[model samples]
Target chain A: TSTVVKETLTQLSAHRALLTSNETLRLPVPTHKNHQLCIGEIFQGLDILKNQTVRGGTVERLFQNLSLIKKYIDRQKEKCGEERRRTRQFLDYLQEFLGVLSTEW
Target chain B: IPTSTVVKETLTQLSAHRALLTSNETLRLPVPTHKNHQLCIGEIFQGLDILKNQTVRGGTVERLFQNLSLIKKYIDRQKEKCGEERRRTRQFLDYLQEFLGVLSTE
Candidate 1:
């Protein structure tokens, strides 16, 4: 005998919990299902990005260097604002994916 | 030997399709590299943490005041980071600022 249970997704506790697991509520880092967030994962991904990067420091010093890099980007923004430079490219791409406002001023 | 030219002119109809897909949001924490930038980021984070704790603690003036000044240092610098596009950083600060202001009196 086939059972027909009519329950909206919002009302179905089990289904809803499964869909919105702990993972879903946090960062949206694109990784395989088998992937886990650990030191190894971080280092592996960092290596990939560093390969494309022109300059990079030692792994131990990278975290210390993070502050300065973030600051330089911020300083660049002050000079031009978000309308110019990589900021615009990042903004445009982000808006394209998010389907949200692209420019305000 | 180098040459630049284009040959062949034939046109055909094209078809395109589009759809909207909602995905999870990703965030990267800002890290400071220079003295000015580091000071600011540190302050902003300190301020946010203070507000965060106060909200949970009911009221803590000493910590809040200390971080409030720190956050101010980086406000302009951090806002500059937004590039005037209006983003989560801006909104987060705005809301947090408002909350901190309310907390100051308490």
Candidate 2:
């Protein structure tokens, strides 16, 4: 469980770095707002996880938040108007982390 | 490292402590002659928000570091309490100590 928690924290940090990085992939205002909200929700979930024993519900909420962020990223990529290589990379990281989290939890 | 970078790291670490100290066990424990541990957590969170630019304030970094120093002292005093609470208190103290170390380096 500690290992899972550590991995989750690492992934959280990675996601935050990618989200806040001065990359070329600029999300539209609404999408960006949702992205920040999802991140905030995950942070709150992690706070609960750390302060209390792990529970299925908390893990489920985290999974749900990550899913939402992935959906936002996917929507951005599906649009063919721009080069989305970095966006795709972000999605990959999100998917990889999500896979680990889903399996581990 | 840049001051902002150090402040960011401090915020992350302090945020973790903020979560840890908010546990029921920690809050139930008393601090000598001051408000409860929970209040300390609130102040810490506010200080973190200021450092993160989530909130605006005067004398931002310097004031936060000063306030954190006092919190660290209170946590240090709490370390001398009974066994069960002392452990969590110590962990929170260690986190704050490291956080203060980062701030002091800047």
Candidate 3:
């Protein structure tokens, strides 16, 4: 992972600790934080994943992908919080990625 | 050591500390389905149904709905898997996001 991955992992790990201690992983139902983007947070919680691993060609690929996604995420945040096509697209993309990733889960 | 080798070693050491896997390391996510090598198999199949109508098999509305449906399940598990899945999963996300851009342009 690169600096972006490091930053994401750090934020994710902290989010996990907060959830574990809280005992209420549940977000507001029918409200904000209600959707499955929280699933992204699940991956963040893993210390094993948060630290370091590899950054060969594949790692480089992963980094590239993340950099783009984060850029999209940040850009989305800057614009309309929701209802933006890209935001929906990013969410869809994130969902499919997680779906694919779940196999390793 | 050659400068190239030194650079390679440095990079390896860096990945070692993170939970991600390099060419040398095998990755291990939690394995959602031991039997199903394709954990997202079901979800993937379902999503395709909604996406673009591969063979005139389904209506466009049906396809759209299928894509929309899987979007819900995808939300349920993001956090638990984000960190570990980052190494491999992010690609799918990038494509997914790109796919979104394509639709918006149309």
Candidate 4:
């Protein structure tokens, strides 16, 4: 297996931890009309990431996909305090994956 | 490492993780779109009745990449609209990041 494969194994092993912890990471639903956009935007990005995995399916491809995804996530304004924290941690995770990607490819 | 078994195992694990995410009640929100600038799977499948029109014609590999030419284009369009659509985008972004962890292995 490649270095990225091993790190990805570590991440998959901890999948439940990351996915479930998101409950706390999410902000309460907002009543503001435009606030819905925040949720919508995140969902679309999620959709894009999923699509990339399905379409690309390579460590190098995923690494590139993640870089773009994080950039998009970072640009989101009106994010709540927790949401901001979550993305920071998310980027931390992505950086590690990127490291693995560079090591392998 | 890139054998079918490896791919299947990895995809299976990722699917489970995806289920964990999509099945979360808290994570469930109305799919987002906009009047002038909208991007979602539903929009891509707009007129086609999934039950009636959409059919599984190929294997998982084919199905995964089957057809999303329009959605791909729309994503490029919204790529620059980062300053707009804050909350909805954040939710998807977090979920996507978590999900991609599975694919990085493959």
Model 1 lDDT per residue over B8-96, tens place: 00000000101101111232223222222222333324423433343333234334334333434434333443322322222322332
Summing lDDT over every window of 10 consecutive residues in candidate 3 chain B, give the lowest-scoring window. B28-37
lDDT of 1: 0.28
The number of the candidate with the highest TM-score is: 3
lDDT of 4 by residue, A1-105 (tens): 234445544443444343343433332222222221334544444444344343333444445544554554344321222131222233233223223322221
User: Model 1: residues >4 Å from true position, as ranges?
Assistant: A1-105, B1-34, B37-56, B60-82, B85-106
TM-score of candidate 3 against the unseen true structure: 0.22
Model 2 steric clash pairs: none
lDDT of each: 0.28, 0.32, 0.33, 0.34
Error (Å) of candidate 4 at residue A94 is 29
| Alpha-carbon shift of residue A16 in model 1 (angstroms) | 59
> lDDT: which is higher, 2 or 3?
3
Q: Estimate each model's TM-score.
A: 0.17, 0.17, 0.22, 0.19
In angstroms, the error of model 1 at A7 is: 69
The Cα error of candidate 1 at residue B23, in Å, is 42
Better of 1 and 3 by TM-score: 3
Listed per candidate, the RMSD to the true structure in angstroms reads 26.4, 23.4, 21.3, 21.4
| lDDT of candidate 1 over A20-65, digit per residue (tens) | 3323122122211111112132233334434443443233244333
Please list the residue runs of candidate 3 whose C-alpha ends up more than 4 Å from where it truly belongs after superposition.
A1-36, A39-50, A81-105, B1-106
Give the 10-residue window scoring lowest on summed lDDT in candidate 1 chain A: A1-10
For candidate 1, the TM-score of chain A alone relative to the native chain A? 0.24
As a whole number from 0 to 100, the lDDT of residue B63 in candidate 3 is 36
Question: Which predicted model would earn the best DockQ?
Answer: 3
